[PDB]
Design a protein around this ligand. Structure first.
Ligand SMILES: CC(C)C[C@H](N)C(=O)O
Ligand SMILES: [Hg+2]
Ligand SMILES: [Zn+2]
Ligand SMILES: [Zn+2]
Length: 876
RNA sequence: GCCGGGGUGGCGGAAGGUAGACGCGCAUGACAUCAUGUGCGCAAGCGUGCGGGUUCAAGUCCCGCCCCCGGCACC
């Protein structure tokens, strides 16, 4: 008997699936239904390795299942060549981006293919191309003319590693997104934004119906950040200006004893009294320079200045000082607060600190507040010390006092959003050139549609396009030295670019019609596939791409080009692939693991000594090693950086794809994190041969056998198996639909076992062949190649055409169950009787069990409880 | 602190009514591989975060805490 040879089959069939273009995406889905399966596309920057390959595989299993079910299936792939991710890397290995990007691609495709992944490569999309980014601009313009693209001054964030700015959603922990070490500083810059706050309520209210993981939803609810409230207006002393302040407790207005403008408020220095102007000017250059790391290092300690102005209280109608504490933020609300310190601890502690008087206005129910009050009273109650309101309920207070202002024109009700507009000007060569020129007569004038695309200049000095501080395009005037399209005057093109996240906010829509040279896509095409039914990807994009994209799909829908409104109907988040990683040498002594200082640094503890048990409980082993010493290993995250990634290309050659796939599929649930391992890769190697051999041992014994038989005339063991099969199908099929591929497969192996146990007493019968025909189609999604090899030993056509095996519900009907006997809960033993076999029978068959355990303690009995399914309990 | 999601064999995990499917590791029997056994306890008996409890039957239901992971935390 021959053996399973990956290298014999796996690459042969690949060549075939492409030639016979199965996953060729249809243009305009007709009858049988549609399914759009999508893996988030890769920034090309590194060679791929299992760690990456998890997600891509998912989508592919999924996609063969749909296509096996006869759905019309779009499973596309492309790249994310533009913006920081690539360039960053290119530069880090001094390579010109085009050469690097069109190279990292080639390698990527070759991995994906190797594994057995299939796409419709006639839809490939290289964002960095002009072919594409032309539209990224087309969008920008359509966005400008609808008021939603603009420039504006303000505090941008600065990444010195990247030598550019980033949007707020790229500042995680308080640090650059792709550099989880380099903190970001603030800088004053007129820059381009996209007005995303014009969609805040929609972005929030449309989440409700969206079937996403509660975790991405929950993050997007809080980040967008609704707050109902009211904009009150404080006149400044004598000055014709007035000061707006967001409050969620306008029922305190009388308790206002001062105001606090956020450090970089225009009105901070503009009102600064010329005595205190010196101290106030120092506190800004202090604030600005201090970063989001150090703000939390300081702790929640209050710190400020008195400006030397005043402000009238709308309500009481008297003066009060105005301060500039940094505990009010400027990128939210007004950048200014009415500060009641008697009902809000933050302000209390500012009042408790800088002697700023503290006024009570909301007296507590039954038991009253003390005087002096020694902390805040944030909970609500009855209004006091507030003139005509004296007696009112704090809850009703809000809407009344709001209403009271709405008359006198002193204020209004409003709903600010935490969402801050999406900055996209990047000071980098690599990235879409913003399609706007700067005029001298006519302001800042757009570019005509038909003039597009605004191509990047070509720049072949690698050590030129390195980003120095200002835009790398500035150094090249010829680019910007152009005319206007409004009159014809002197004209500097904008030297800035679009962030990579831009292109990654509709690529899903581009895939539907990826050669259209007139639009970003013919809508008839978009609507024919969208929404995406399955977006297979990860949490790290919860408030970035998965926010940006939607706003884009909304605004594209608000030009009426896409009918839907949420682009992904089905987000499925996935787990990181972990590997066992060598951490370094260790000095063992009896039962005391001493840690040298590079191996402790790498572990990230402070300790040097450890018990062997201390190693265990942090989930690590100590192994031998090449160098002679003992070495400590612990699962760590599979990255290039960690130097622990299982490489796809090499790995395929010295093992296989299907084994790759079974390994990354059958370990953990998909949404869990998993650990790729020798122990598991072998598991695969076993499971895949028990498939092979069992169909090899029966190759002759099948050919001369027909897979036709009268369903209800199978008796005995042919009757059992056929049941088990169909029970199995139901589980393989229900667990494909759920995306539960771990257990899905387990359930496939269980039958294989049972198929070995079938053949032990029972030769190749029709049932068994049909048991195989089925098994192999049930295998095609995961182990497609070994699944195709065995099929074609018998059948003339591909598994893709074979159709998803149809379920026979009446095989699931259980007859002669195994039913557990218990007496007072303790499961004494099990008996075998038909489902409906009534109470009177079970009694009989129990009374004389394996160890007559039912009698052992059943010498009384009072009530008795049968239940047809699987239980019979005797009481006492 | 708030939100989000988890505490079940030696491991990843499976699931009101036989807890521990399937695999890994371990252990013996075959000519690495297949077969066979494997919650724990020598046993009495015990076991799904910890305590009560409701139920003939609780991983599953109720009341009261605990703890780990992820994110947001002067908004
Ligand atoms: C969907 C995309 C924003 C994904 C991104 N290109 C990445 O590689 O993570
Ligand atoms: Hg390109
Ligand atoms: Zn950076
Ligand atoms: Zn002009």
């Amino acid at each position: 008997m021959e053996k399973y040879n990956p290298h014999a089959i796996e690459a042969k069939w690949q060549r075939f699936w492409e030639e016979k273009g199965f996953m060729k995406a249809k243009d305009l889905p007709g009858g049988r239904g549609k399914q759009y399966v999508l893996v988030m596309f890769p920034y090309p920057s590194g060679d791929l390795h299992m760690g990456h390959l998890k997600n891509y595989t998912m989508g592919d299993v999924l996609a063969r299942f749909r296509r096996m079910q006869g759905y019309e299936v779009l499973h596309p792939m492309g790249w994310d060549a533009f913006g920081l991710p690539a360039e960053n890397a290119a530069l880090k290995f001094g390579v010109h981006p085009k050469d690097w990007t069109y190279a990292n691609i080639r390698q990527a495709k070759e991995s994906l293919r190797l594994m057995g992944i299939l796409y419709d490569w006639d839809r490939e999309v290289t964002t960095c191309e002009p072919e594409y980014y032309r539209w990224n601009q087309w969008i920008f313009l359509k966005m400008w003319e609808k008021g939603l693209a603009y420039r504006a001054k303000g505090l941008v964030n600065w990444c010195p590693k990247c030598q550019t700015v980033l949007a707020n959603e790229q500042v995680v922990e308080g640090r650059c997104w792709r550099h989880e070490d380099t903190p970001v500083e603030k800088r004053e810059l007129e820059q381009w934004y996209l007005r995303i706050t014009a969609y805040a309520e929609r972005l929030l209210k449309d989440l409700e119906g969206l079937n996403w993981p509660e975790k991405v939803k929950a993050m997007q609810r809080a980040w967008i950040g609704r707050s109902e409230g009211a904009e009150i207006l404080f006149p400044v002393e004598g000055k014709e200006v007035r000061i707006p302040v967001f409050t969620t407790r306008p029922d305190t207005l009388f308790g206002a004893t001062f105001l606090v403008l956020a450090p970089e408020h225009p009105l901070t220095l503009e009102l600064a009294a010329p005595e205190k102007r010196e101290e106030v000017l120092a506190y800004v250059e202090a604030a600005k320079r201090k970063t989001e790391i150090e703000r939390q290092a300081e702790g929640r300690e209050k710190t400020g200045v008195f400006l030397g102005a005043y402000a009238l209280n709308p309500a009481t109608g008297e003066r009060i000082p105005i301060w500039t504490a940094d505990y009010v933020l400027f990128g939210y609300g007004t950048g200014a607060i009415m500060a009641v310190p008697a009902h809000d601890q933050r302000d209390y502690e500012f009042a408790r600190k800088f002697g700023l008087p503290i006024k009570k206005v909301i007296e507590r129910p039954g038991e009253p507040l003390p005087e002096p009050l020694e902390r805040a009273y944030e909970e609500p109650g009855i209004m006091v010390n507030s003139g005509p309101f004296d007696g009112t309920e704090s809850e009703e207070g809000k809407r009344k006092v709001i209403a009271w202002l709405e008359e006198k024109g002193l204020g209004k009700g409003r709903v600010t959003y935490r969402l801050r507009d999406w900055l996209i000007s990047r000071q980098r060569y690599w990235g879409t050139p913003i399609p706007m020129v700067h005029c001298e007569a006519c302001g800042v004038v757009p570019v005509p549609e038909e003039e597009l695309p605004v191509l990047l200049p070509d720049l072949k000095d690698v050590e030129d396009i390195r980003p120095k501080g200002k835009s790398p395009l500035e150094a090249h005037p010829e680019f910007y030295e152009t005319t206007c399209p409004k009159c014809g005057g002197p004209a500097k093109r904008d030297t800035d670019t679009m962030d990579t996240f831009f292109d990654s906010s509709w690529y899903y829509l581009r895939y539907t019609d990826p050669h259209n040279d007139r639009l970003p896509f013919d809508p008839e095409k978009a609507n024919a596939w969208m929404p995406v039914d399955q977006y297979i990807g990860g949490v790290e994009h919860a408030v970035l791409h998965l926010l940006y994209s939607r706003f884009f799909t909304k605004f594209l829908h608000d030009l009426g080009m896409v009918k839907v409104e949420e682009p992904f109907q089905g987000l499925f988040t996935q787990g990181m692939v972990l590997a066992w990683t060598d951490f370094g040498p260790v000095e063992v002594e009896g039962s005391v693991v001493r840690l040298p200082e590079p191996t402790r640094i790498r572990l990230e503890i402070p300790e040097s000594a450890l018990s062997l048990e201390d190693v265990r409980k942090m989930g690590a082993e100590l192994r031998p090693h090449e160098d002679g010493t003992l070495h400590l290993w612990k699962p760590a995250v599979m990255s290039k950086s960690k130097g622990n990634g299982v490489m796809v290309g090499p790995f395929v050659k010295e093992q296989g794809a299907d084994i790759a796939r079974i390994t990354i599929l059958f370990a953990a649930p998909p949404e869990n994190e998993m650990v790729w391992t020798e122990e598991g890769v072998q598991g695969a190697w076993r499971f895949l041969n028990r498939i092979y051999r069992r169909v090899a041992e029966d190759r002759e014994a099948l050919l001369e056998t027909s897979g036709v038989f009268q369903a209800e005339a199978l008796e005995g063991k042919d009757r059992e198996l056929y049941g088990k099969l169909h029970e199995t199908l139901k589980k393989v099929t229900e667990d494909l639909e759920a995306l539960r591929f771990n257990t899905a497969i387990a359930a496939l192996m269980e039958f294989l076992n049972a198929l070995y146990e079938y053949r032990k007493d029972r030769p190749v019968t029709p049932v068994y062949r049909t048991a195989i025909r089925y098994y192999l189609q049930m295998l095609f999604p995961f182990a497609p190649h070994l699944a195709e090899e065995l099929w074609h030993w018998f059948w003339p056509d591909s598994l893709f055409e074979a159709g998803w095996p149809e379920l026979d519900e009446k095989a699931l009907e259980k007859d002669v169950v195994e039913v557990a006997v218990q007496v007072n809960g303790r499961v004494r033993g099990t008996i075998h009787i038909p489902k409906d076999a009534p109470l009177e029978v079970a009694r009989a068959e129990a009374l004389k069990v394996r160890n007559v355990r039912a009698h052992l303690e059943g010498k009384e009995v009072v009530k008795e409880i049968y239940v047809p399914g699987k239980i019979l309990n005797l009481v006492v």
